[PDB]
A and B are shown apart, each in its own frame.
With several copies, the nearest count.
Chain A
Amino acid sequence: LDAEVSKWDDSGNDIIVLAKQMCMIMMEMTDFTRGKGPLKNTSDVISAAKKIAEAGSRMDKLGRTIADHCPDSACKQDLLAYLQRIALYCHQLNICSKVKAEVQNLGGVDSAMSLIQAAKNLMNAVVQTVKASYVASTKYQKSQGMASLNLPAVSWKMKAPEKKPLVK
């Protein structure tokens, strides 16, 4: 349920764009549970899960690059926690796809559903670390080390949230 969270543009250019790729591949992945998308058998779900695993490893790399220059605890510990979560989810997805592929070529819907739940947890972790990396980047923009990565607050496309309903 991150389409309401994924209100961005094609800016950011390193973090937001692969986050949008992972969001659209989740939105096409979990449509297979409704069964009206471009996914027919189970092996394309394995290739999709391998795609999100590789993209989560790349996001883990970029999150490790931004986390070196954050000075102290206040957001850096949150960022490291979400990085360990996304590392666990991607590495679990990587070699959970292999056992489902080997079950497939040696002998049928719940097999997709486990990878669907793993991808859902991976997507929640990746939007959490996108938010945490935004906080860590725009918190310490005057600090040395952040300015060399060249990620200003304008480059993030996070608008202010909606007006909360006053009644009902």
Chain B
Amino acid sequence: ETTALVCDNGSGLVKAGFAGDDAPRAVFPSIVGRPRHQGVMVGMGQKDSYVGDEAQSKRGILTLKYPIEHGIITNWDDMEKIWHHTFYNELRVAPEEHPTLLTEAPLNPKANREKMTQIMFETFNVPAMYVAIQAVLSLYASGRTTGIVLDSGDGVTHNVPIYEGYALPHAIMRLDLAGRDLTDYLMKILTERGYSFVTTAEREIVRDIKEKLCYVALDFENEMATAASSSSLEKSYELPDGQVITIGNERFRCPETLFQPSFIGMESAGIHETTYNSIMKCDIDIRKDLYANNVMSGGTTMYPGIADRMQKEITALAPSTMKIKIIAPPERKYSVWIGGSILASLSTFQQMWITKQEYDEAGPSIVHRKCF
């Protein structure tokens, strides 16, 4: 009769809700803001920190910090503030009545998961908790059990190949290029238009620019060439102040970092080439099913036209005798949440939590021999 709580603590958007549901009830950016000015009024000077949407509304007077950068957690005193805002202030449930399910990118440091379950037990007193891999839940949300997962969140971009039940942990390819690096490259590439976005409160504005304008070209060279004859690729976006900005080739040079990471100096391969590189790390028998089942979770795979370029860029690398199907579900931004609503509400799961009586005798090291 009790329900389970699920909380995808992403790098840019904390999503949370109840198990068995079909949509997250709370979604808010995981920002902690400190005020940085004097505060001359005698009231409204005691509020020392702001979290979530009330920091997103007041971002002009706050230094903004994400506690999660590239999947790992660098500030625990802000992460417990964000979780305390998540459970009480927006979900309005007590943690002691519901078991909780958290989300972790693969190949993370063990100290991150250890301090995460220690904070979840010895501060909020949950009955039971479970941390799951951020990519294995995307296959639950897609309805499948085979396929490789290209989860490109805000922090990290990881490819996990999973045949029917069984993952292949020697082929989990985690690349540190994601939406925050595209946001910083859009800050760097909008300087050539004349616009200077320097503070951390303008990162939100250029993130909104990336939201509503940036698409990815099917072919990059000729689309770059037609931007020289600047006639139809410019687009105007209105700022919060009122000034309009015009954007030309910067509209599609920003997602092209996903397929050419040498633009920001990263010695790596693009997300089309590490996918074929990661399928080739697998065995030759399951390679046919992994080629034909390519799910894409994460918000950074919500650019207009990333499925077409992903298919076109794999099919020049794969052998040309069997098809590639980049299956891109339309709700994929919340996809990591949706599988979290499945696995927590599944009937055969309830003897695979981490109970509090199992934690206090074995310490926080119980989370490694239970989850992965």
Residues of A within 8 A of B (CB): 74-75, 77-78, 80-82, 84-85, 87-89, 91-93, 95-96, 98-99, 101-103, 107, 110-111, 113-115, 117-118, 121, 131, 134-135, 138-139, 153, 158, 160-167
Whether A88 contacts B47 in the complex (CB less than 8 A), given A95-B22, A99-B331, A114-B329, comes out as no
CB distance A114 to B142 under 8 Å?
A: yes
Report the contact-size class of chain B (Cβ under 8 Å from the partner). Answer: 35 or more
Chain B interface main SS type: loop
Chain B, residue nearest A158 (CB) = B92
The answer, among B44, B88, B327, B338, for a CB contact under 8 Å with A99, is B338
For the complex, what is the distance from the CA of A101 to the CA of B22, rounded to whole Å?
10
Q: Are A166 and B327 in contact (CB under 8 A)?
A: no
Q: Is the CB of A92 within 8 A of B46?
A: no
Among B25, B47, B48, B144, point to the contact of A162 (Cβ < 8 A).
Answer: B25
Q: Which of the segments B172-180, B223-231, B345-353 contacts the partner chain?
A: B345-353
B20 part of interface (Cβ distance < 8 Å): yes
User: What residues make up the interface of B, taking CB atoms closer than 8 Å to A?
Assistant: 18, 20-27, 41-44, 46-48, 84, 88-94, 140-145, 164, 327-331, 333-334, 338, 341-342, 345-348
A114-B144 contact in complex given A84-B44, A139-B88, A167-B331, C-beta closer than 8 Å: yes
A135 contacts B27, C-beta separation under 8 Å: no
Query: Which of A87, A102, A110 contacts B43 (CB under 8 A)?
Result: A87
Bound-state CA distance A93–B145 (Å) is 12
Interface of A is mostly: helix
B153 nearest CB across to chain A (Å) = 17
Complex CA distance for A164 and B23, rounded to whole angstroms: 6
Q: Tell me, in angstroms, the Cα distance from A161 to B93 when the chains sit together.
A: 11
12 contacts between A and B (CB under 8 A): A77-B46, A81-B47, A91-B347, A95-B345, A99-B338, A101-B22, A110-B328, A113-B327, A121-B164, A161-B25, A164-B23, A164-B27
**Do B25 and A99 touch across chains, with their CB atoms under 8 A apart?**
no
CB–CB A87/B329 < 8 A: no
CB of B328 within 8 A of CB of A99, answer no
Known: A88-B348, A95-B341. 15 other contacts (CB 8 A): A74-B84, A81-B46, A87-B347, A92-B342, A95-B22, A114-B144, A114-B327, A117-B144, A121-B144, A131-B89, A135-B89, A160-B18, A163-B23, A166-B331, A167-B331
Q: From B28, which residue of chain A is reached at the shortest CB distance?
A: A164
User: How many Å lie between the Cα of A92 and that of B344 in the bound state?
Assistant: 11
List chain B residues, Cβ under 8 A from A161: 25-26, 90
Most chain B CB inside 10 Å of its own CB: which residue of A75, A107, A160? A160
Residues of chain A contacted by B93 (CB below 8 angstroms): 160
Residues in A neighbouring B22, C-beta threshold 8 A = 95, 98-99, 101-102, 163
B349 CB to nearest chain A CB (Å): 9
A84: nearest residue on chain B (CB-CB)? B43
Q: Which of B25, B44, B94, B345 contacts A160 (CB 8 A)?
A: B25
Whether the pair A84, B348 counts as a contact (CB closer than 8 A) is yes
